[PDB]
């Protein structure tokens, strides 16, 4: 059974499960269904937003925050309609409007994208917002032993 | 050692107010001294006090203390690496010692609870067994960790007497 | 004979008891159908200084 | 006057009655305890409230309880 | 007129939103969340005659029962959104 | 019945004797149940091995410098030494990344030897007693001779090296010179370079 480390509520039915529940948040079956769908939405938004962010960061150079700045109305109404329609449906059929291994790899790549986006958020906070995440990756590719996180004096104390 | 200024506090070694504090105290000592002829014992005692004041002020200068506007050293207890000797290391020493005292006490009270008459041994302390438990309490952090992991540190809820509420 | 045998340790269940949730030795159980037949003896004294009192069958557990 | 209540945990040791300084308490026959007797408080009007009965009651928790209420001359223990 | 277009449009937009998007959710919530009750019974059922429910709140020919109180609530929301937009816009213009 | 640290008295009950290094030495009774006892046997193994490596790596720069064949720094200012491939913290984070995997696998073995290489799926570990894996961990791998003797030899050498490493840590904390420098000074004047001249110049 694939697991988050060899030799350690959770069942095989949940797609792409690896035993990782230290806090046992998914212990509650009710909360477990909400947590499943919660992760699902999170990773879907994170794949799209990673793809966006790499594009915008690189777009005309700059960063994702640089191309960030009544304007909210148009997005708000459409997303509210879509989200209400998603909510109003029933469990395990509300997802696809119109196989298992595809879900497995989808969710795994999603978790990677979520973690990458969280890293983008952390790096933008830690750094002075000058270089973007792609630019930070390029810097790491330049001289990784001397531009890694410990050389950053904001991520760590004592410079 | 030379410490960086922190929280608007200059180092005591380079602080003019620290030098003024030293100067003032030493001058007071001299004044106290002047009335005594040098041969008499109070004169030597006061000179030794002056020496002690000088070496104290010097040691406080070198020990990386931060002084304020008043001119007296100020302790940094936020955890800063440059001022760990102010609170962290003596804090660790206190936590170790106090936990030793407490664990020696807990061990003795638990051991005496098995005696035929525990309350008499509570006031007449079995000194050999007491000292044995006291020196066993040198490894208090370990033994406390064992008790926590095994669940015997804390008594269960059902065994403890409580109010009827 | 009903109730705990003599000599056993019984957990007190009376909420108001000084020795609530504590363990005490059973001295005797009265078989004449009294309301509180279980006599329980306690190592530790209460605020009144007594070391024993009477309990019902449902006010003890063993 | 005060209120004095006797509860069925009473063992009939008579110590509440012997401790009362105003003769409020008395022992009556009763099948509930081994000793065959329960206390009672007929002369509740004479209860000064000194709570000597509660101090002398061995049963845990107390089988006799005094609840201070309306204060009369006798309850206040006044010679005037 | 800039203010009139953005404001009227916004208010009507909010009204439509209440009428179709969150109307089923709002009605489901008022079904799930009963009338306020004190000691297990409604204020009116407990004697608060001044807590008598109104009658005009159900007199509606709307297919989705968008009563007058729903109209007033969603018009308030639309007015709040519109005036927020106007106010923010004025800040961004002259400050 | 085993050889005992205190010949006159008798060994404690919880110390069976079969343990590789059981000389009945447990005055402050930390042994107690066998479960934390195993946690200690493994802890002692690790402390002995790491301190043997520690003593050897704190002596070797000193031996090489004093002989004059490699002008290396002292162990205490070795971290202070500048010239490493990267910043002290950068290589420290890399170091702890590299050690997190190996030590959590050892913890899994501590918890369950059976539980714990996917890098080379053919490469496995032969099943062995906890704390003594063998296989790839001993490329020399001549265990066909005496075993318990050799394990006891490792343990006692480890215990000695740990006492030695604590000693030298105190020695630098009280003299501020290399351990071999302290050693040779004690050779030069044995009656006037010993502990009585320790002063605690710096922690
Ligand atoms: C918000 C994103 C999110 C959400 C809702 C979940 C939720 C879930 N994950 Mg997923 N997961 C995520 C991010 C997320 N994860 C990321 C980034 C990783 C990679 C580090 C993982 C790695 C992972 C593995 C390997 C496994 C799960 C599993 C689970 C389930 C049980 C754990 C639980 O109840 O977590 C609920 C989580 C939250 C409520 C978020 C709390 C966040 C805290 C407050 C801050 C951090 C549940 C469906 C297990 C499962 O059922 O398989 C699908 C499982 O085996 N997840
Ligand atoms: C997708 C994962 C991912 C990737 C590829 C990177 C990559 C990078 N980060 Mg970011 N970061 C991440 C997640 C990630 N980070 C997360 C989750 C956080 C929040 C804790 C941060 C917080 C962060 C800060 C604050 C800083 C960086 C910095 C950096 C750069 C170099 C130093 C470094 O990596 O150490 C930091 C790495 C970690 C703390 C690891 C987080 C755990 C990850 C999610 C595990 C998986 C990583 C990866 C897939 C494993 C294989 C590595 C292999 C390819 C070599 C480099 C561009 C530095 C930089 O550019 O400025 C100098 C910097 O200062 N990162
Ligand atoms: C000159 C120095 C000095 C002196 C005289 C005292 C004197 C005292 N301290 Mg203080 N203290 C000091 C420095 C000093 N302290 C410093 C520098 C620190 C920072 C570490 C503390 C932190 C500290 C705490 C946190 C507590 C005390 C307490 C006490 C009292 C009992 C201590 C004891 O050993 O009882 C004998 C010891 C025992 C009976 C064992 C009890 C548990 C001990 C106190 C701690 C062990 C628990 C463990 C390490 C977890 C700590 C959790 C904590 C971080 C919250 C006593 C009045 C205690 C007190 O009075 O609070 C009500 C208390 O709780 N001290
Ligand atoms: C066996 C020793 C022992 C131990 C382990 C504890 C432990 C504790 N006490 Mg208690 N306590 C003790 C003795 C002890 N107490 C004694 C002798 C007194 C009477 C002065 C008290 C009075 C007392 C009060 C009033 C309070 C506590 C509180 C607490 C808790 C907070 C930490 C603390 O100790 O700060 C308190 C520390 C002190 C008051 C200092 C007194 C401790 C002395 C120094 C120990 C003397 C015994 C010594 C070890 C010698 C006996 C053994 C020897 C013969 C071998 C903790 C559970 C507090 C609590 O409930 O927190 C949740 C609280 O409010 N304790
Ligand atoms: C930190 C390393 C370490 C560890 C984990 C152990 C652990 C063990 N030793 Mg080993 N031992 C060590 C160091 C260590 N020893 C050293 C340096 C020596 C040489 C002086 C020995 C000599 C020795 C002998 C001769 C024997 C043991 C025995 C034992 C076992 C008894 C249980 C016990 O009380 O120990 C648990 C102890 C700890 C977890 C650490 C204690 C730390 C102390 C209390 C605080 C520091 C004080 C100190 C003065 C500094 C256990 C497996 C007995 C055994 O059965 O053999 C296997 C036995 O006969 N050991
Ligand atoms: C355990 C342990 C640890 C933590 C260290 C750590 C270190 N050693 Mg030491 N060493 C050890 C054991 C250890 N060694 C053993 C067992 C031997 C034999 C040596 C022999 C040795 C030599 C000969 C040298 C080091 C050097 C070094 C440093 C650089 C290592 C590197 O790869 O770059 C570093 C501080 C080097 C050094 O001094 O770098 C400045 C160096 O020249 N070590
Ligand atoms: C005095 C030093 C000493 C001694 C006698 C041993 C002896 C032993 N070790 Mg240990 N070991 C030591 C130091 C030592 N080790 C150190 C410093 C490390 C850390 C690098 C290790 C790491 C280690 C591991 C990871 C493993 C062993 C294993 C073994 C056994 C077989 C290999 C061997 O060295 O035997 C040959 C005989 C000798 C006398 C050589 C001594 C070394 C000299 C330089 C044997 C019981 C293996 C085992 O369990 O085997 C069954 C095993 O898996 N040891
Ligand atoms: C294998 C153990 C071992 C060995 C061979 C040495 C050897 C030496 N030590 Mg070290 N030392 C040790 C352990 C050891 N020490 C331990 C455990 C401590 C902590 C208590 C110290 C603390 C220490 C200090 C503070 C000083 C020395 C000094 C010395 C030197 C002078 C001899 C002397 O005064 O003895 C001192 C011996 C002891 C204090 C303890 C006895 C050692 C063990 C337990 C028994 C013998 C084996 C000599 C090179 C001095 C130095 O630097 O000389 C130049 C010095 O100033 N030692
Ligand atoms: C990482 C993350 C959440 C992680 C949660 C984790 C690890 C929880 C794990 C646990 O529960 C488990 C599993 C097991 C439990 O026992 C314990 C824990 C450990 C607690 C969410 C990411 C969530 C990430 C998301 C939703 C990504 C969103 C991206 C978006 C919106 C795009 C935004 C942009 O497009 C805009 C808006 C504007 C442009 O200017 C900018 C860009 C950036 C281009
Ligand atoms: C006839 C009809 C129709 C139509 C209807 C309509 C269109 C209606 C409307 C209605 C409306 C149109 C309403 C409105 C309302 C509004 C309101 C009710 C308002 C309010 C306001 C407010 C509340 C305000 C507040 C404020 C102020 C005062 C100032 C400050 C700011 C603010 C904004 C907050 C149809 C065809 C569909 C159908 C059939 C019938
Ligand atoms: S009340 Fe207390 S004292 Fe008076 S009889 Fe009943 S038990 Fe004995
Ligand atoms: S209170 Fe004083 S008077 Fe009233 S009953 Fe108890 S004892 Fe007798």
UniProtKB/Swiss-Prot annotation, chain D:
Binding annotation for [4Fe-4S] cluster 1: 10, 13, 16, 57
InterPro entries linked to this entry: 4Fe4S_Fe-S-bd (IPR017896), 4Fe4S_Fe_S_CS (IPR017900), PSI_iron-sulfur_center (IPR050157), PSI_PsaC (IPR017491)
Annotated positions binding [4Fe-4S] cluster 2: 20, 47, 50, 53
Limits of the 4Fe-4S ferredoxin-type domain: 1-30, 38-67
Catalytic function, reaction form: reduced [plastocyanin] + hnu + oxidized [2Fe-2S]-[ferredoxin] = oxidized [plastocyanin] + reduced [2Fe-2S]-[ferredoxin]
Gene Ontology annotations for the cellular component aspect, listed alphabetically: chloroplast thylakoid membrane; photosystem I
Molecular function via GO: 4 iron, 4 sulfur cluster binding; electron transfer activity; metal ion binding; oxidoreductase activity
Keyword line: 4Fe-4S, Chloroplast, Electron transport, Iron, Iron-sulfur, Membrane, Metal-binding, Oxidoreductase, Photosynthesis, Photosystem I, Plastid, Repeat, Thylakoid, Transport
EC number: 1.97.1.12
Statement: the UniProt record of this protein carries the keyword Plastid: yes
Topology within the bilayer: Peripheral membrane protein
Cellular compartment(s): Plastid, Chloroplast thylakoid membrane
Biological process annotations from GO: photosynthetic electron transport in photosystem I
Cofactor: [4Fe-4S] cluster
SUPFAM superfamilies (UniProt xref): 4Fe-4S ferredoxins (SSF54862)
Cofactor note: Binds 2 [4Fe-4S] clusters. Cluster 2 is most probably the spectroscopically characterized electron acceptor FA and cluster 1 is most probably FB.
Pfam families: Fer4_7
Cited Gene3D superfamilies: 3.30.70.20
Subunit structure, as described in the record: The eukaryotic PSI reaction center is composed of at least 11 subunits.
Biological role: Apoprotein for the two 4Fe-4S centers FA and FB of photosystem I (PSI); essential for photochemical activity. FB is the terminal electron acceptor of PSI, donating electrons to ferredoxin. The C-terminus interacts with PsaA/B/D and helps assemble the protein into the PSI complex. Required for binding of PsaD and PsaE to PSI. PSI is a plastocyanin/cytochrome c6-ferredoxin oxidoreductase, converting photonic excitation into a charge separation, which transfers an electron from the donor P700 chlorophyll pair to the spectroscopically characterized acceptors A0, A1, FX, FA and FB in turn.
HAMAP family xrefs: PSI_PsaC
Name of this chain's protein: Photosystem I iron-sulfur center
Source organism per UniProt: Ostreococcus tauri
Organism phylogeny: Eukaryota, Viridiplantae, Chlorophyta, Mamiellophyceae, Mamiellales
Gene designation: psaC
